[PDB]
Design a protein around this ligand. Structure first.
Ligand SMILES: CC(C)c1ccc2c(c1)c(SC(C)(C)C)c(CC(C)(C)C(=O)O)n2Cc1ccc(Cl)cc1
Ligand SMILES: CC(C)c1ccc2c(c1)c(SC(C)(C)C)c(CC(C)(C)C(=O)O)n2Cc1ccc(Cl)cc1
Ligand SMILES: CC(C)c1ccc2c(c1)c(SC(C)(C)C)c(CC(C)(C)C(=O)O)n2Cc1ccc(Cl)cc1
Lengths: 154, 139, 144
């Protein structure tokens, strides 16, 4: 439905987003598998093995929207390629963090990657305003010249 | 990488989202600090964070729907109010229903606006096509 | 703020998202009413399980809609919500559903996105193939 130009600005971000979706499903798969090691309803408490996978998942899930926000913020406002690479790095950290709970690491992981993607977005927004104000200064500059050189055209 | 014109339609929204990211970092940090030192104080901070995390993707959804389909300024302003109400809740240990509703209504209003402009464009096109055919033999 | 043409490519995705927001509010309301117990644990777990999966759903819904085709994506998203309703009420006897629901819908929206990306690269390479083809003739048929 969308044009070829704007999809080229998101394609790398979309690929890394799709990889994270596969990863999320893998995490969910691990939880469900560990849930059926117990034998009728789904509970959020259980054996030590289940509680470690469930909590690990819970941490990964709690940080997903934030990661998704900064990834796309960095990719669209600043630059796509670096943001997508840092996005991939976050996924590799998640993978090692999630398996790291399988005997424990802390509640938060990949703080610096979130920070880096956040910084890019700040730089991108500042880069947006710099180009906007330069555009309005160029517009005012041409408008001032036009009124000044106006009678000289007649 | 995107053009100047589209980025100007999402910039106010993106700032609010980034501030919410810092606030999410703050909430997660406050939980992390209490996790290192089960506890009666830990359960209050964990639940508060969990209550914010559970509502966050819904908020992010209505903020961006209202901003893109309706008007950016009121949506971003309401989004900033949500992060203020969110902040006060984390001190006292569902919040901001009325804000979520306001953004939801903005989106629906923006959607209704889209269709009005679409059908008007359809009406205008059909009207010009109707005159064009009946007038064609005259030239 | 966005132009009519681009908003036209996201309307159905927006509507679905908005219905899902209503459903999230319903689930959250069902939790708050129960919080004034086993009845509370089940509603909380059902909502939590739904919430956990929601951003993954929202990601593939829009990816599918934007990259592949809006109508099939929006309808599949709508199907996801019906399944999500049966799943939530299924927690509300000693037996409940598992942790995962609507995974085949997620898979379908995923595969749409992949297909939409492969569609992008096909037109792009064809666009460079055309560009390179024109440049070859423009050099050959030139000194005339
Ligand atoms: C509710 C959601 C979070 C969710 C949960 C589980 C999911 C999916 C989506 C998907 S769809 C996706 C692969 C993510 C595009 C699948 C994979 C399929 C082939 C459909 C399957 O095994 O049933 N699983 C199980 C699975 C995922 C990843 C690994 Cl590594 C192995 C098995
Ligand atoms: C899981 C995720 C959502 C997350 C969690 C914690 C995070 C970050 C990201 C970030 S990066 C961000 C500030 C969100 C752009 C930081 C801050 C940094 C500078 C990296 C640090 O101190 O380690 N913290 C700790 C922190 C944040 C905010 C306050 Cl008020 C105090 C401490
Ligand atoms: C945390 C977040 C996801 C959330 C949670 C609860 C929410 C809302 C938003 C909204 S806003 C929305 C309905 C989504 C437009 C409402 C409805 C209102 C009218 C504001 C109310 O009763 O307070 N509730 C309660 C409610 C929602 C849906 C049903 Cl079916 C019945 C009651």
């Amino acid at each position: 439905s969308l044009d070829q130009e704007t999809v080229g600005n998101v394609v790398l971000l979309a690929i890394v987003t799709l990889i994270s979706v596969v990863q999320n499903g893998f995490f969910a798969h691990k939880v469900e598998h560990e849930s059926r090691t117990q034998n009728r309803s789904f509970q959020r408490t259980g054996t030590l093995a289940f509680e470690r996978v469930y909590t690990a998942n819970q941490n990964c899930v709690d940080a997903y929207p934030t990661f998704l926000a900064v990834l796309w913020s960095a990719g669209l406002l600043c630059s796509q390629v670096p943001a997508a690479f840092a996005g991939l790095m976050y996924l590799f950290v998640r993978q090692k963090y999630f398996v790291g709970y399988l005997g424990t690491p802390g509640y938060i992981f990949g703080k610096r990657i979130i920070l880096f993607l956040f910084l890019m977005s700040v730089a991108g927004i500042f880069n947006y305003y710099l180009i906007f104000f330069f555009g309005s200064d160029f517009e005012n500059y041409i408008a001032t010249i036009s009124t000044t050189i106006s009678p000289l055209l007649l």
